[PDB]
Amino acid sequence: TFAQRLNSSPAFSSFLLKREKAESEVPPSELELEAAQKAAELEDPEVALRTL
Amino acid sequence: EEEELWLLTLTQQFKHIQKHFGIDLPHSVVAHMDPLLIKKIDWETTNALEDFDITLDDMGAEDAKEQWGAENLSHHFLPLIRYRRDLARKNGDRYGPDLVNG
Amino acid sequence: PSQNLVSTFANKVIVEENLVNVAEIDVPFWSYWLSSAGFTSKDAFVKFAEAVKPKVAALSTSDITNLTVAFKRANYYDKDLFTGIEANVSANFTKFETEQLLQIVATFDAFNHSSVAFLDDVADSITYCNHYLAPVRAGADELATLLTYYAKNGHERADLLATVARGFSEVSLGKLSAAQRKDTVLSALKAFQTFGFYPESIEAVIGAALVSPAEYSAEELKEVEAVKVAAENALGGEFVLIQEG
Amino acid sequence: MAVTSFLGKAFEKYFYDFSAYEQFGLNRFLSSKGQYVALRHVGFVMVGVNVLLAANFPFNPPFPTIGMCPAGWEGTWVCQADKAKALEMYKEWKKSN
Amino acid sequence: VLGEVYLKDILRTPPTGAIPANVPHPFQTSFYTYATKKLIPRHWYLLGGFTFTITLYGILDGLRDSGKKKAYDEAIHAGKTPYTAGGH
Amino acid sequence: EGNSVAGIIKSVNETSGANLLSSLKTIKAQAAPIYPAAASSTGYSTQAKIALFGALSWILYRADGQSKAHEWIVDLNLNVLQAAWLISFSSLIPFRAVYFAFRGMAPATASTLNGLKTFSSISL
Amino acid sequence: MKLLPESLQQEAATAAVVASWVLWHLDTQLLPTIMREHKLHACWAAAAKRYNEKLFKLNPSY
Amino acid sequence: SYSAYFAKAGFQFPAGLSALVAGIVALNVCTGRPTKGTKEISNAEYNATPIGYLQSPDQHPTAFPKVPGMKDVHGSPHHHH
Amino acid sequence: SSVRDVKTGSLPTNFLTGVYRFWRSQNPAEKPHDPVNDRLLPAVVDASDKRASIGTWATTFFCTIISCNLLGLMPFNEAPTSGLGFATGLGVSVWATATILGLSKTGFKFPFIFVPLETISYTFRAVSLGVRLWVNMLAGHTLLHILTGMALALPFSLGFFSMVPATFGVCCLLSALVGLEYLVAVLQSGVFSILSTVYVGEFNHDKFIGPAAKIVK
Numbered sequence A: 001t002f003a004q005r006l007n008s009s010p011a012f013s014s015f016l017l018k019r020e021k022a023e024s025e026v027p028p029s030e031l032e033l034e035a036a037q038k039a040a041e042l043e044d045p046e047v048a049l050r051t052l
Numbered sequence B: 001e002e003e004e005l006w007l008l009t010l011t012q013q014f015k016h017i018q019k020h021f022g023i024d025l026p027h028s029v030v031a032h033m034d035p036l037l038i039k040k041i042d043w044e045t046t047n048a049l050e051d052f053d054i055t056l057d058d059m060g061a062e063d064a065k066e067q068w069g070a071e072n073l074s075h076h077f078l079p080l081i082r083y084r085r086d087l088a089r090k091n092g093d094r095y096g097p098d099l100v101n102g
Numbered sequence C: 001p002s003q004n005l006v007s008t009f010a011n012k013v014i015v016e017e018n019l020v021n022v023a024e025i026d027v028p029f030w031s032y033w034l035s036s037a038g039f040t041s042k043d044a045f046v047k048f049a050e051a052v053k054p055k056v057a058a059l060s061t062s063d064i065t066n067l068t069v070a071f072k073r074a075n076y077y078d079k080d081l082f083t084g085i086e087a088n089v090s091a092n093f094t095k096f097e098t099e100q101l102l103q104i105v106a107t108f109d110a111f112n113h114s115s116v117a118f119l120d121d122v123a124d125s126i127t128y129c130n131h132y133l134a135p136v137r138a139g140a141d142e143l144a145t146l147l148t149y150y151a152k153n154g155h156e157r158a159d160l161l162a163t164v165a166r167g168f169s170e171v172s173l174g175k176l177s178a179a180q181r182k183d184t185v186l187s188a189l190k191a192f193q194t195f196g197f198y199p200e201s202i203e204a205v206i207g208a209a210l211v212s213p214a215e216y217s218a219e220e221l222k223e224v225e226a227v228k229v230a231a232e233n234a235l236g237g238e239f240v241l242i243q244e245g
Numbered sequence D: 001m002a003v004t005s006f007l008g009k010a011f012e013k014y015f016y017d018f019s020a021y022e023q024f025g026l027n028r029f030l031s032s033k034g035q036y037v038a039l040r041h042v043g044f045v046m047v048g049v050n051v052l053l054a055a056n057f058p059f060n061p062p063f064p065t066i067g068m069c070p071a072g073w074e075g076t077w078v079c080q081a082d083k084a085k086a087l088e089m090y091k092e093w094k095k096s097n
Numbered sequence E: 001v002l003g004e005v006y007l008k009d010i011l012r013t014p015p016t017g018a019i020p021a022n023v024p025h026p027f028q029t030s031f032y033t034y035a036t037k038k039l040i041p042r043h044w045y046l047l048g049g050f051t052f053t054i055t056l057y058g059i060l061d062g063l064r065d066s067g068k069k070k071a072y073d074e075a076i077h078a079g080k081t082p083y084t085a086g087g088h
Numbered sequence F: 001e002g003n004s005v006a007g008i009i010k011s012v013n014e015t016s017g018a019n020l021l022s023s024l025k026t027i028k029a030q031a032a033p034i035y036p037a038a039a040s041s042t043g044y045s046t047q048a049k050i051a052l053f054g055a056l057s058w059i060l061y062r063a064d065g066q067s068k069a070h071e072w073i074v075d076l077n078l079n080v081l082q083a084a085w086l087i088s089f090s091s092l093i094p095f096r097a098v099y100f101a102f103r104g105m106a107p108a109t110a111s112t113l114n115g116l117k118t119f120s121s122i123s124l
Numbered sequence G: 001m002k003l004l005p006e007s008l009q010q011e012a013a014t015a016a017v018v019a020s021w022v023l024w025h026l027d028t029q030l031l032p033t034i035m036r037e038h039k040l041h042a043c044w045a046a047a048a049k050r051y052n053e054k055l056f057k058l059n060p061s062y
Numbered sequence H: 001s002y003s004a005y006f007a008k009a010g011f012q013f014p015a016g017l018s019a020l021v022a023g024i025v026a027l028n029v030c031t032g033r034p035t036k037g038t039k040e041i042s043n044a045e046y047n048a049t050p051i052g053y054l055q056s057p058d059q060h061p062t063a064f065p066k067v068p069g070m071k072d073v074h075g076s077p078h079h080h081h
Numbered sequence I: 001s002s003v004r005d006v007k008t009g010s011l012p013t014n015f016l017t018g019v020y021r022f023w024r025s026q027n028p029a030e031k032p033h034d035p036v037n038d039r040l041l042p043a044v045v046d047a048s049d050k051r052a053s054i055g056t057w058a059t060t061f062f063c064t065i066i067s068c069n070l071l072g073l074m075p076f077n078e079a080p081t082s083g084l085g086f087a088t089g090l091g092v093s094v095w096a097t098a099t100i101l102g103l104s105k106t107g108f109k110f111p112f113i114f115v116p117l118e119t120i121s122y123t124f125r126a127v128s129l130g131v132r133l134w135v136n137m138l139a140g141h142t143l144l145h146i147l148t149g150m151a152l153a154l155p156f157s158l159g160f161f162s163m164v165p166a167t168f169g170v171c172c173l174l175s176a177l178v179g180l181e182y183l184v185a186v187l188q189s190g191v192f193s194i195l196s197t198v199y200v201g202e203f204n205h206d207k208f209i210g211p212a213a214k215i216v217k
């Protein structure tokens, strides 16, 4: 998700933002959580061919 | 499969930009993926029009703002229309959108 | 005994054709700047045209622009060089800007040398590879020669015509002298009626003539009125001069 | 150690979770943490003024005192007002000390 | 088919070999392009303001040292010392 | 370095149907972009060393000049009065709120991108 | 106290040098970098509707 | 995912800082006047004078003065009183 | 040739984007009479090149003045804008920029008895724009010097770490004064650059060229 990609950004490995989490500011909604799960399913392309 | 390379290049390039923009995408990867967009934006910076979209929505121009955005991304359809122009030149006709009233 | 050596060395070491032996290792730079110093000298530009031929096809865009406007300003036309310059433009058309392509097209409109590939690649570059307000930054004395270069070869490119017609306005025509403004209004109206393309910004080219008719003949005002009637019928309205107030 | 990394991790620990607001108790006497840092600020200033006064104490003050005396001096060059008199008084006081 | 020479220098994909260098703006390469395209045609009012201030403050410095010269001369042509005898 | 979609197209076209679905993760990983791994540090580069040495040299030179300034203990205590507010700002400023509030100042980061809505650019 | 400087023109020229460098560094190094990432987003967000309609009309795969 | 590409480039100065530092030093050292506490003399006066008789007491104040006004050097005793 | 690579969405890029767009929104463009299309686009570009870059100048002055103002709040440092020549030179150079712009608009020609007092009210803002910044940066630091000279004498005369609350009640006041110094250091940069936009945008008005011919209906 967008917060989960912001957490791995260079801005959150800096010193003043090292203990913080990007989920704390605006949490991801349930649609982008389930879209992250569905996209984690489909990074195997044979899974995508068989479900398509 | 005739024009799959262009559409899938557009899809992959924008998917990577949108996945990484404003988080960790470097400017070199943006200028690599989209060189002519960076060229046009650098024309606006070079020719003192760095606030041109700010000027356009300062004067309420919405259609000129959409035209500015569409003319800065007009080179995305350049591979397609060059391919279709060379197809119509291999078949002796002329490419349709290159004509004034046709 | 100084005046004797100064008089014998004033044309033995310093002469206008030994500078062209140092000016061969970087020929677009020296070609452009000695052309801007007035050193036209066709018998040295024959040397220049063959001194650059084995390395034209790997040049920058600015080097090609320098070469092309220099050989315009020295009025020399080596077509065996200009095919290599056309190959350099057509192989790197995405890297040229409109301020370079207008100078290259003005040179090639002097020396009538064209291809379908060059016309298509220059139109593709000006339309899609450059900013859409780069005709606005151009000055109409070069957009008129671009329209002339396209109407001479009969190359109809409505995308290029709509892009180039942005650069015609009160602003870009008011920066011209009245003789040059008459020249560009005439050539622009002729090349606009040749293609049958009447954009909304043709009314600036027409009103550049209609607010001052004292510069044109009856035949030239007939040529302006013909395109005024055609553009009245094409744009679906009636022409009107606007007065301040 | 690495001269880039060990003190970096040590300062990360000291800044983030080596907190003396609870490791020295201190909830039982103060209301908030916004009141603790507001008092840690003035405590840092008072510690700084006391340390910089004490680190070189036998000195004649540049700042205008309010006609008071530090300790058992009371007439010395520490309590003088015109500076040349305190200057020569320090010049005689220094050879004896 | 559309065959990767229509996509040359127009559309590229995210790089797999190595991350390239950042394309410089024309102002970041040469100072002459900046100085002749933006600094003089757009910022010559600021440069004229900075030069006006530098010349005006040179004028004020000239007034101040001429006043110092006048006071020093009228102390020398009075037999008097022109300063506070140093201080020490 | 040619574009990776033509690499996908070529690497899919020259594979037999028996070993297509086995080979799909190899073509997926051959065209994934390069994210370079965390190389070994060798920290404090030459410009960072120039910065830290110049900052320490400036602090030492300014502290030599403050301590002989006729109001010298007042200057040495003003350094304390200022470092106290540096310490106080590093303790009550919300840095995640400041990060996401500066991020909202730019329109580039106040919202996500918008083009290419995935139905216009399918190749069926 | 320190009210007038030892040279007024030197301090005014220091102000001019510092503000002229900040103008150059803005206009040359920062504002291209500001405007690249601002106008990529801005051209996409303004173009998106007409771009997607033009691309819908241009591909034959429906 | 690009986070380890930016950690490779370390600290780096602003892209024209040498021009700013060169300009400020070329204003602070190319002044056109003696160096604020010194005075220009003739060469014979420089070669005739001892180094302690060439310094002023004002320009060497004590680094942590016990009395405000304490100086390190005392300079020339040749007062023209 | 070899410029540095920039992360997209960095915090300095976001901050400077917001700052530049703030100072550019102070002198907005004028909405013309005709609707903006390809006919009006060279007139809009031309009006955008006859407007001064007050956005760029104002963020130049905001960034240099807020960095010089916040230098005075770091330890071992003085503000450069607490110098009379620095701050007053920035003010006189903004006023001279506005005047040079307004002079190049008309002719480089210098303009009853009501108007020379309007001139000496107009030529005063050269003094006022600089010395507001200078006196604001000087007066807080001077009060800070004085009031910590009064705050040092009571731990001097009494014991260190003894009779604490009379020194606590003046160290709280010194802390509040340096907090006011931070607020003033931001607000005076803001006031200087708002006023630079006002003074320069008084003369930032030219003639919209527009269409001198039309095909109506």
Ligand SMILES: [Zn+2]
Pocket (backbone or CB within 6 Å): F075, F078, I141, I145
């Ligand atoms: Zn101080």
